[PDB]
From a paper:
The CD1 family of MHC-class I-like molecules present an array of endogenous and foreign lipids Ags that are recognized by specialized T-cell populations. Here we describe a diverse population of [name]–α-GalCer reactive cells that we termed ‘atypical NKT cells' because they lack the invariant TRAV10+TRAJ18+ α-chain and the TRBV25-1 β-chain that are inherent to type I NKT cells. Crystal structures of two of these atypical NKT TCRs in complex with [name]–α-GalCer showed that, in contrast to type I NKT cell TCRs that dock over the F′-pocket of [name]–α-GalCer, these atypical TCRs docked orthogonally over the A′-pocket of [name]–α-GalCer. Thus, variations in the [name]–α-GalCer-reactive NKT [name] repertoire can manifest in alternative docking strategies on [name] and diverse reactivity towards [name]-restricted lipids.
Next, to establish how atypical NKT [name] usage manifested in [name]–Ag recognition, we determined the crystal structures of the 9C1 [name]-[name]–α-GalCer and 9B2 [name]-[name]–α-GalCer ternary complexes to 2.5 and 3.1 Å resolution, respectively. The 9C1 [name] docked orthogonally (75°) across the A′-pocket of [name], in which the 9C1 [name] α-chain was located above the [name] α2-helix, while the [name] β-chain was more centrally positioned over the [name] α1-helix. On ligation, the buried surface area (BSA) of the 9C1 [name] was ∼750 Å2, whereupon the [name] α-chain contributed the most (∼460 Å2) to the 9C1 [name]-[name]–α-GalCer interface. In the 9C1 [name]–[name]–α-GalCer ternary complex, the CDR3α loop (35% BSA) played a principal role in the interactions. As such, the CDR3α was wedged within the Ag-binding cleft, with Thr109α stacking against Trp160 and hydrogen bonding to Thr157 of [name], while Gln112α formed vdw contacts with Val72 and hydrogen bonded to His68 of [name]. The interactions between the 9C1 [name]–8-encoded [name] β-chain and [name] were more limited, being largely dominated by the CDR2β (BSA 14%) and neighbouring framework regions ligating to the α1-helix of [name]. In the 9C1 [name] ternary complex, both the α- and β-chains mediated lipid Ag recognition, with direct interactions arising from the CDR3α, CDR2β and CDR3β loops. Here, the main chain carbonyl of Arg109β hydrogen bonded to the 4′-OH of α-GalCer, the latter of which also contacted Ser31β via a water-mediated hydrogen bond. The 6′-OH hydrogen bonded to Gln112α and Gln57β and interacted with the framework residue Tyr55β. Interestingly, while the Tyr31αAla mutant abrogated recognition, the Tyr31αPhe 9C1 variant increased the affinity for [name]–α-GalCer, presumably by reinforcing the hydrophobic character of the 9C1 [name]-[name]–α-GalCer interface.
Author numbering:
A (entry chain C): 3 to 277
B (entry chain F): 2 to 97
C (entry chain A): 0 to 32, 39 to 62, 66 to 68, 74 to 216
D (entry chain B): 0 to 31, 39 to 61, 66 to 81, 83 to 254
């Protein structure tokens, strides 16, 4: 039932144990698929799919490869300088969440969020870096230094507003054959632990589905039983998913209940399991 | 700050005379540094594959640890995690 | 796409006082900055003007340089050109996520002086050390006169050179010719060149 | 400029197959360093880039024979192993701050030749003004002629009474080949010094033409009978004529 969205999410994990020990690791997601991997040990961004470069030429990919190499070295050098200036103690952990989403015909949406020790400190907005609603005093000082760099502001603007929506459309076109993949789930009913004395737990398992958009509801014929506990969509190594949907019901009201599964691979033929 | 959520499950339904994969989804933790290993009948599994370290929108991390196995009737499976938020390494028993 | 910087024209010989235009085109419009340089033979770049991506125009002295990213163009205008401007002018750009300058091949600009009172003449100059060795000096010719290289291999001719006697305001053009040949005469020295009809040759 | 980028050697003549090392001293505090290559009648072409001590862009490096260093984030050396005739060029070094407005050094002119016996210093001669010129224009032109030199690594200057002069001076923009149908041709360079007849007519006035040649060093091997063609100043002089 849910709409399949395809934003490009470029994630960066930078750890600083001491002034001497550091590593920068990253990856790229196109929706729920991982297209790229980036280790501190390698000098290039690793392609995971045969269609990961998109419609970009070898020359265009090399320019990005160059920007990421210069960025990592520069980023890892700037944090050490900032920690010395703003008197910030090690260990340090910085996270970057950059990317965009393409809306064919209409204007594209972009983002660049930076977190410090799991909390939002700043983000790129329009043509400059901007602090979070509530941000420590040392963030405003780091922003004063960061906003003085005309070149980085222009590189980030050009990467987000220009390069990124182009790259997304290229991936959507080069990987389309793999993006239309459908993997039918296996479903079954079970009785989970007793939640109360005169009550029982109904469990509906949906296993091995791809893509991730799914709909699972406990039903009384056609009446949607609000009180369905969907839980987390858990991952499988083969890129398929797992989901459990439970329902707390007092003994007797379990009769006439069913579980309705809606998924794209089912081609309209919903899985309906009666308890 | 953020304590890890541990969930142990298998790719396919459990069967005595059949090959399967033992998954362990560790999520909602912070910082990045985490210790994870799949235990079988007590001892740890040396050949245990894992996914590339990633994080959710709330900035908390997540990982999928997996290994090919056969659910033996006498072999009891679980997963052990050690983190900065934990006083002792947490052990979550796999429930079929 | 790899950046390609192009400059039109490759060479330009203009008379003193004229307002000249130097063109620069680039295929990649994602420009961080555009830098115009001056280079004298045979090495060393002199920074003239820098236009920033946001900027449309930059002025400094008789120089004005415009930038148009959308048309992938940059122009260097030189006002009231002087002989001193005579050099190779290079246009180069830095792209948005790049550091390196990508250069054009350059415009070889020659600004010839305005010779108000021409007195074309070819003089024989004897060496201070010995009477045997001598050179031929073609001088005081107007800038419309062009000195041609020698057809004979054993005769050497230089291109025209401009000197300014700042104390007297006087400007002068000259070319030197010499050979080791016995039949070499100063009268026959600039025979391959179209020298003025009123050229003076002393006995 | 006074406080700019320095490069050394300014001129280098190397034998084919020999190793050469080029030094660049950037502007103090400049985080960025760049190397460029400039072929004869061509625009400069990017070689390599340094941000502090890290060589973050080596795309322009032609082959394995070219290797650059900047270990302390200051001085950069560019080394060319087993040099060839195609390596003959001006190697330009530049430095900048974060704005990437590049300040260029004076460059290194590298000439790669077959044998070092090809190297010759110039012969310098001063040609005295013609009395016909003195009678006709009341102006007096001295001509200086530097001949038979190789490589094309000369700096000509005129000295009047122990002081260098620029007024009424014109040196050829580039030397001419004494045999244009040859790669290893020796060169000739001329310059003109023009003064008033009266200034030349004073026998107290001394006119000197100096040609600074850049040739062989103490480390270069020499086996020819003739004097080793080292870095030297070759001059010619003239005293004023009463007439
Ligand atoms: C994206 C679509 C393409 C698809 C590709 C496929 C995906 C690839 C796979 C995984 C991606 C991994 C995730 C990483 C996402 C980040 C996107 C790259 C953004 C590059 C910015 C370029 C500017 C730069 O590099 N800037 C550097 C260099 O600048 C210096 O050198 C230049 C010449 O090289 C110039 O002269 C310049 O003036 C000078 O400052 C800065 O140092 C910058 O400040 C680094 C940090 C930028 C982020 C700022 C946020 C950090 C705030 C932390 C502060 C708190 C620290 C406290 C301890
Ligand atoms: C740097 O951090 C690592 C973290 O594992 C540690 O092993 C190393 O000893 C630290 N070095 C210093 C100089 O503190
Ligand atoms: C990450 O890469 C940098 C590259 O300069 C290196 O210095 C650092 O030691 C690497 N980190 C680890 C953990 O190997």
């Amino acid at each position: 039932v849910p709409q399949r969205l395809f934003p490009l999410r470029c994630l960066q994990i930078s750890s600083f144990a001491n002034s001497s020990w550091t590593r920068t690791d990253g990856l790229a997601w196109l929706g729920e698929l991982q297209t790229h991997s980036w280790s501190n040990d390698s000098d290039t961004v690793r392609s995971l799919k045969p269609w990961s470069q998109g419609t970009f030429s070898d020359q265009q990919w090399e320019t990005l490869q160059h920007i990421f190499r210069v960025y990592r070295s520069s980023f890892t050098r700037d944090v050490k300088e900032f920690a010395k200036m703003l008197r910030l103690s090690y260990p340090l952990e910085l996270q970057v969440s950059a990317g965009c989403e393409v809306h064919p015909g209409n204007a594209s949406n972009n983002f660049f969020h930076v977190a410090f020790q799991g909390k939002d400190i700043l983000s790129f907005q329009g043509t400059s870096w901007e602090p979070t609603q509530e941000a420590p005093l040392w963030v405003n000082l780091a922003i004063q230094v960061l906003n003085q760099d005309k070149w980085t502001r222009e590189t980030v603007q050009w990467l987000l507003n220009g390069t990124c929506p182009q790259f997304v459309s290229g991936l959507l076109e080069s990987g389309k054959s793999e993006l239309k993949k459908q993997v039918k789930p296996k479903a079954w009913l079970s009785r989970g632990p007793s939640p109360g004395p005169g009550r029982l737990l109904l469990v509906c398992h949906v296993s091995g589905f791809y893509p991730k958009p799914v709909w699972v509801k406990w039903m009384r014929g056609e009446q949607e039983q609000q009180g369905t506990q969907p839980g987390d969509i858990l991952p499988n190594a083969d890129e398929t998913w797992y989901l459990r949907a439970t329902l707390d019901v007092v003994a007797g009201e379990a009769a006439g209940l069913s579980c309705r599964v809606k998924h794209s691979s089912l081609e309209g033929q919903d899985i309906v399991l009666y308890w | 700050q953020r304590t890890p959520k541990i969930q142990v499950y298998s790719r396919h339904p459990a069967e005595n005379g059949k090959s399967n994969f033992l998954n362990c989804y560790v999520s909602g933790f912070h910082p990045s540094d985490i210790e994870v290993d799949l235990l079988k009948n007590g001892e740890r599994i040396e050949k245990v594959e894992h996914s590339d370290l990633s994080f959710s929108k709330d900035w908390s991390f997540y990982l999928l640890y997996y290994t090919e196995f056969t659910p033996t009737e006498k072999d009891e499976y679980a997963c052990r995690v050690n983190h900065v938020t934990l006083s002792q390494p947490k052990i979550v028993k796999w429930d079929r | 796409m790899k950046q390609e910087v192009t400059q039109i024209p490759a060479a330009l010989s203009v008379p003193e006082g004229e307002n000249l235009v130097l063109n620069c085109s680039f295929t990649d419009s994602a420009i961080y900055n555009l830098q115009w340089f001056r280079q004298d033979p045979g090495k060393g770049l002199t920074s003239l003007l820098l236009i920033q991506s946001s900027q449309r125009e930059q002025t400094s002295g008789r120089l004005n340089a415009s930038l148009d990213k959308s048309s992938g163009r940059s122009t260097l205008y030189i006002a009231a050109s002087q002989p001193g401007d005579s050099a190779t002018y290079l246009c180069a750009g830095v792209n948005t996520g790049f550091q390196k300058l990508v250069f054009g091949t350059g415009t070889r600009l020659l600004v010839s002086p305005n010779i108000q009172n021409p007195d074309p003449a070819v003089y024989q100059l004897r060496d201070s050390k010995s009477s045997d060795k001598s050179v031929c000096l073609f001088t005081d010719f107007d800038s419309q006169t062009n000195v041609s290289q020698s057809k004979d291999s054993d005769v050497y001719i230089t291109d025209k050179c401009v000197l300014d006697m700042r104390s007297m305001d006087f400007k002068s053009n000259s070319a030197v010719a010499w050979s080791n040949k016995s039949d070499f005469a100063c009268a026959n020295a600039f025979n391959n060149s179209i020298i003025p009809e009123d050229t003076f040759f002393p006995s | 400029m006074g406080a700019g980028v320095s490069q050394s050697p300014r001129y280098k003549v190397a034998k084919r197959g020999q190793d050469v090392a080029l030094r660049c001293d950037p502007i103090s505090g400049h985080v960025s360093l760049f190397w460029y290559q400039q072929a004869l009648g061509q625009g400069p072409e990017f070689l390599t880039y340094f941000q502090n001590e890290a060589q973050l862009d080596k795309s322009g490096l032609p082959s394995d024979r070219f290797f650059a260093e900047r270990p302390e984030g200051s001085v950069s050396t560019l080394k060319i192993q087993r040099t060839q005739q195609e390596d003959s060029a001006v190697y330009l070094c530049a430095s900048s701050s974060r704005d990437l407005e590049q300040y260029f050094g004076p460059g290194t002119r590298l000439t790669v030749t077959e044998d070092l016996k090809n190297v010759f210093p110039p012969e310098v001669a001063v040609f005295e003004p013609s009395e016909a010129e003195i009678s006709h224009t009341q102006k007096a032109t001295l001509v200086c002629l530097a001949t038979g030199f190789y490589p094309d690594h000369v700096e000509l200057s005129w000295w009047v009474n122990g002081k260098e002069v620029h007024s009424g001076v014109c040196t050829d923009p580039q030397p001419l080949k004494e045999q244009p149908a040859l790669n290893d041709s020796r060169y000739a360079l001329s310059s003109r010094l023009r003064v008033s007849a009266t200034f030349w007519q004073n026998p107290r006035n001394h006119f000197r033409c100096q040609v600074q040649f850049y040739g062989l060093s103490e480390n270069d091997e020499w086996t020819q009978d003739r004097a080793k063609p080292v870095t030297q100043i070759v001059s010619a002089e003239a005293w004023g004529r009463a007439d």
